[PDB]
Write a protein that binds this ligand. Structure first.
Ligand SMILES: [Mg+2]
Ligand SMILES: [Mg+2]
Ligand SMILES: [Mg+2]
Ligand SMILES: [Mg+2]
Ligand SMILES: [Mg+2]
Lengths: 63, 137, 143, 145, 67, 199, 70, 100
RNA sequence: UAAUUGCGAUAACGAACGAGACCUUAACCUACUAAAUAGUGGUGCUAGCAUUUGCUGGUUAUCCACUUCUUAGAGGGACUAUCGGUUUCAAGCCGAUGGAAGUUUGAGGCAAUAACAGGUCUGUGAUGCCCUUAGACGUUCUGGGCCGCACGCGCGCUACACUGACGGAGCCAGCGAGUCUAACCUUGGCCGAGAGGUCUUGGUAAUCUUGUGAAACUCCGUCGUGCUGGGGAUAGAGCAUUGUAAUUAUUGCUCUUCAACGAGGAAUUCCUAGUAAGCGCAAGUCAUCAGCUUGCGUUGAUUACGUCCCUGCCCUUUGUACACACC
């Protein structure tokens, strides 16, 4: 399984029908000059680092 | 000289006097507090500041009022507060601050009592918030 | 070395005093042993037919040593537990009064416990003597 | 714990007072399978028989089994109190029995049959199959099958 | 929520309106002076009023506020 | 080392508590490090404790749960099934026995074994009902690892000879070694499996 | 009655040459690896702890933690 | 000089304290020796009842409280100025019992 | 903002109710007052152990001093205080520190205007009308019934076990109640296996019951994974208690019998911290009868710190052929 880690530099807001998912602007630990927006289920805050099984999949909002 | 400690409803009154390192809890030694797993909870305010560290004090506590765990927490707070008060009154303010700093950096309510008290039960259910099961059909 | 019953807490002292009452030879048993449950809230007799009366005696003697006078009703409340009332909720039930009274009378006969002027049974002089001897023996036996 | 080789002296399921008893269960609870002896009666009987309760029923003895049997059939003769018996002042001789056979049900059916013949309410309820101890029958014990 | 109601806001408003050459921007002396310069019927209400008066003093020291 | 004495005799096994490199009543904390960088700041070794019964307020704030000792979090999760609600002394005894059994089998610093099991069994990708594959927060990863480990131990100890302490020890050991014989690893693998099918 | 109640001597070597191949010994281990039933696994481990190869780690009621001797 | 104990019981704390303070001041102004006014814990005579006079509606319960406060002051005083200090206390709502 | 809470905006200005404020209670106060109805030390007397005077003990008319624990009066204390950040421009909000306590500090009590053909005429010597009023629908007495069982539903208790049952031993609460015209709460002694009986005793109660020696829980053992020592339904026999009266078993106790139940479909409830859950205790009813309720304490999690998807609520805009108002 390919290795990639990232770190929330900004928490955008809640999304999902029930508000359970949160959108995070995440910056990859390697090659820190690039940011992708991801959907994370559990509680997150700033400078908190996530593991992404898939690296490049831009998360959109969840209607 | 006289201090106390409380967790929920148990109060533990500790007398710290001039003596030679004798630590009684209900007339028994502190080695016999006996929940058999929370004995280090009452050992902790001795192992924190200094393991023996004291041939000069005598601590006698008497605890009543709660349950086994509550009483253990009350006595563990009482003897810490007794050491702090004895050092404040007699030994020196520098050493009092020095041991207060360790107790508070390890604080498990060693010096400040836990302020959590039971919430009153309200009608329409058992417990403070739990309600009786509601049926519609 | 200034050893009291309050120096060995709960199990070593009681097992050791029970063993001492066993080896003392005096049984003091009423013969009800092996038949009785020790509480109406119990479901079975004590698992060790021989020795449970001695353990009860040692427990009662230590209990009276640790405090002032104690009566049969206090002993029944102390030694009674919760009762399984079937599909009904549990409830505390007092233990058997006859066994507690007879064990109090046995300690009275052996001079471990005496009458209190205000009621109940109080540890006696030789009571404290033997209890403290057993405590010091247990302490030096097992640190 | 010790040498328990006992190649030919261990017994599997046995026979005891018209009831097959498993010898692999400790003696008291193995004995409880006979209709009429429960946990407490079996404990008292096995302690009046001077039998070691800490061993299984299959290795007890070929004599202690009959000692237990005779103590059970005659409880009051081996210093076992009347209040420990399930049949005291039975209905017709005043003696205290402890029915221990495939006759617990025989005594039960004699009681039920005399209650039916006297036309008592309990007998009538038993005949109808309903509850007899005054329980509410509106909601409980519906299927009973 | 810790929004002060009108009975606190206007009481502090009038207190600051007629007692500026008076109690400083410290709550401890503000409440003591409120004890003498106002008939507040509860200690909790007096504390609320004094705290809002102190807040108003502190934000007055950086420039006048409306009203 | 310098086991000086006072009137109440307290054993030297308790007088050797902190004169030297700190530990548990039995087990070192300083030689415990998280297996990865994602779960640091959410596993809470060092601070060390003498017993997993720090009856502290960790629920009045959102992330104060992250600063509770991970051993005590595991104890709290063992406090479950409803019939065992409360019974914290029981759960602490179970944790002590579990750590002892882990130290017996491939000693490997049972605290380190526990933290490795948690790090291995935290689900890295889950699904939300919109059915959509979302990522998992580190705190949620830790909580789901603890829940999966404790639930697997519970359902293994249910209706079988071996004790809850032994089932917890086996679960934690298998999870730390990262094997598909553990309930928590199997469940994490299943969640990550049907998350990629809902990407 | 299911297994290993009283007899346990047709391979009575399995209470002695059992110490290798595992470091953890308990009531449940004795039941699980087809040697003893838990009815007497407790007294078996107590016996061979009194004279035998296992040394106790915790020795708590309703539990047992023993390990092979070094 | 006879030793007497005065027990004051009332639901109204303000007038119970008025009586207790009148007694203390009278004992001081008559130069008596008195053990201070002991305040035994107030008994909250609570009663729980159903608000509805029938059986309909949400089961809302209602707790009523009667707080009874009790005080005893014992001292030593001669007959005339013990009768006068028991007859000075006729404050309404406070029950006063002097026991010798 | 919890708030028609406020900043403010402004054909409104100034007010009233509601919210808040308030009151009760739960947190703290080595500060004040004061306590053989609370407690602590030391002197008396003084059993044990140890004997260089020390540990633990009893001394309820055995002294003195004190109020840390307890009690209850008067008060103090918190006002989101201080410091940062961020707010349009403030109201505020978010962090950290200090603090006993920073979510209205926690929990309640009280709680507007309009209504409902909501419930109650079976609480009322509240009550209109109608009915009945001597063979009564008044009232009383005996007996029965309200509980009756092919079955459907709601609240629950006990469980399905080893995170356990059983046996010993450990031995820890809080809220309360209790009898003088008299039979209430009962300690202690004795008898009884038990339930219980009997002789006394204390208590009109911070005094005695009562430290309510509660239960879960803890330790050490037996059990050993099996409808098993899980479970205790059903039933038989006997012993007691309450009561004038226990049959349709009041309840308690002893022995015996040992059912379903192997964690429960679709559905559905309650709940965010000393909370859920587990655990028992007091009170209410009460001669007797808790699986109920009202409170109380003991042990004490997991999860979340959000959203409007479901079910609803508030405000605004909008459509309406609805006004008995989308049933
Ligand atoms: Mg017990
Ligand atoms: Mg109607
Ligand atoms: Mg009815
Ligand atoms: Mg009812
Ligand atoms: Mg329609």
């Amino acid at each position: 399984t390919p290795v990639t880690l990232a770190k929330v530099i900004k928490v955008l807001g809640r999304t999902g029908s029930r508000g359970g998912v949160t959108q995070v602007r995440v910056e990859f630990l390697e090659d820190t000059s690039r940011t992708i927006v991801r959907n994370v289920k559990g509680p997150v805050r700033e400078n908190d680092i996530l593991v992404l099984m898939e690296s490049e999949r831009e998360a959109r909002r969840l209607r | 000289v006289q201090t106390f400690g409380k967790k929920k409803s148990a109060t533990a009154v500790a007398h710290v006097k001039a003596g030679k390192g004798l630590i009684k809890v209900n007339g028994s030694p502190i080695t016999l507090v006996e929940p058999e797993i929370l004995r280090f909870k009452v050992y902790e305010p001795l192992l924190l500041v200094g393991l023996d560290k004291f041939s000069n004090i005598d601590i006698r506590v008497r605890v009543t009022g709660g349950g086994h765990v509550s009483q253990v927490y009350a006595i563990r707070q009482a003897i810490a507060k007794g050491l702090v008060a004895y050092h404040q009154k007699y030994v020196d303010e520098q050493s009092k601050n020095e041991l207060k700093k360790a107790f508070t950096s390890y604080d498990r309510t060693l010096l400040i009592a836990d302020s959590r008290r039971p919430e009153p039960k309200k009608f329409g259910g058992k417990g403070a918030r739990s309600r009786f099961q509601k049926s519609y059909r | 070395p200034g050893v009291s019953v309050r120096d060995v807490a709960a199990q070593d002292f009681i097992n050791a005093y029970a063993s001492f009452l066993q080896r003392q030879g005096k049984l003091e048993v009423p013969g009800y042993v092996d038949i009785v449950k020790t509480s109406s809230g119990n479901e079975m007799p004590p698992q060790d037919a021989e020795g449970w009366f001695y353990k009860r005696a040692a427990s009662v003697a230590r209990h009276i040593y640790m405090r002032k006078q104690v009566g049969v009703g206090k002993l029944n409340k102390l030694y009674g537990g919760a009762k399984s009332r079937g599909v009904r909720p549990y409830k505390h039930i007092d233990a058997s009064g006859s066994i507690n009274r007879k064990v109090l009378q046995a300690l009275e006969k052996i001079g471990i416990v005496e009458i209190s002027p205000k009621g109940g049974r109080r540890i006696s002089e030789n009571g404290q003597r033997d209890l403290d001897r057993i405590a010091a023996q247990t302490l030096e036996e097992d640190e | 714990s010790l040498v328990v080789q006992e190649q030919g002296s261990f017994q599997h399921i046995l026979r005891l007072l018209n009831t097959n008893v498993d010898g692999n269960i400790k003696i008291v609870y193995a004995l409880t399978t006979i209709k009429g002896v429960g946990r407490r009666y079996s404990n008292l009987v096995c302690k009046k028989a001077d039998v070691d309760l800490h061993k299984r029923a299959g290795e007890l003895t070929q004599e202690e089994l009959e000692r237990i049997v005779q103590i059970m059939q005659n409880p009051t003769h081996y210093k076992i109190p009347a209040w420990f018996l399930n049949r005291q002042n039975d209905i017709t001789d005043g003696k205290d029995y402890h029915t221990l056979a495939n006759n617990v049900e025989s005594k039960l059916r004699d009681d039920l049959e005399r209650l039916k013949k006297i036309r008592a309410h309990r007998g009538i309820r038993h005949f109808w199959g309903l509850r007899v101890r005054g329980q509410h029958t509106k909601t409980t014990g519906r299927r009973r099958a | 929520g810790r929004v002060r109601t009108k009975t606190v806001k206007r009481a502090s408003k009038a207190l600051i309106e007629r007692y500026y050459p008076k109690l400083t921007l410290d709550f401890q002396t503000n409440k003591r002076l409120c004890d003498e310069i106002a008939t507040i019927q509860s200690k909790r209400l007096r504390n609320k009023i004094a705290g809002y008066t102190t807040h108003l003093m502190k934000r007055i020291q950086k420039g006048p506020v409306r009203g | 080392f310098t086991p000086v004495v006072l009137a109440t005799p307290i054993p030297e096994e308790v007088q050797q508590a902190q004169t030297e490199i700190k530990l548990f009543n039995k087990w070192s904390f300083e030689e415990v490090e998280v297996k990865d960088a994602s779960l640091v700041d959410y596993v809470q070794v060092r601070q060390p404790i003498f017993v997993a019964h720090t009856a502290g307020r960790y629920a009045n704030k959102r992330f104060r749960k992250a600063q509770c000792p991970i051993i005590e979090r595991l104890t709290n999760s063992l406090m479950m099934n409803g019939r065992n609600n409360g019974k914290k002394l029981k759960a602490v005894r179970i944790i002590k026995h579990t750590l002892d059994i882990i130290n017996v089998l491939t000693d490997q610093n049972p605290i380190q074994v526990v933290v490795d099991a948690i790090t291995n069994t935290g689900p890295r990708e889950d699904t939300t009902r919109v059915r959509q594959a979302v990522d998992v927060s580190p705190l949620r990863r830790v909580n789901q690892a603890i829940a999966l480990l404790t639930i697997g131990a519970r359902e293994a100890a249910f209706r079988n000879i071996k004790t809850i302490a032994e089932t917890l020890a086996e679960e934690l050991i298998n999870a730390a070694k990262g094997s598909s014989t553990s309930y928590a690893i199997k469940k994490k693998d299943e969640l990550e499996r049907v998350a990629k099918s809902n990407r | 009655a299911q297994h290993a109640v009283i007899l346990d001597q047709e391979k009575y070597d399995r209470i002695l040459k059992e110490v290798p191949t595992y470091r953890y010994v308990s009531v449940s281990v004795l039941v699980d690896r087809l040697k003893i039933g838990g009815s007497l696994a407790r007294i078996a481990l107590r016996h061979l702890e009194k004279e035998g190869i296992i040394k106790p780690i915790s020795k708590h009621s309703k539990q047992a933690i023993y390990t092979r001797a070094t | 000089i006879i030793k007497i104990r005065i027990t004051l019981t009332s639901t109204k704390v303000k007038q119970l304290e008025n009586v207790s303070s009148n007694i203390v001041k009278n004992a001081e102004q008559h130069n008596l020796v008195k053990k201070g006014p002991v305040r035994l814990p107030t008994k909250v005579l609570k009663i729980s009842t159903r608000k509805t006079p029938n059986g309909e509606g949400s089961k809302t319960w209602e707790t009523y409280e009667m707080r009874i406060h009790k005080r005893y002051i014992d001292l030593e005083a001669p007959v005339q100025i013990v009768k006068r200090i028991t007859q000075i206390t006729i404050e309404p709502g406070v029950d006063v019992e002097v026991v010798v």
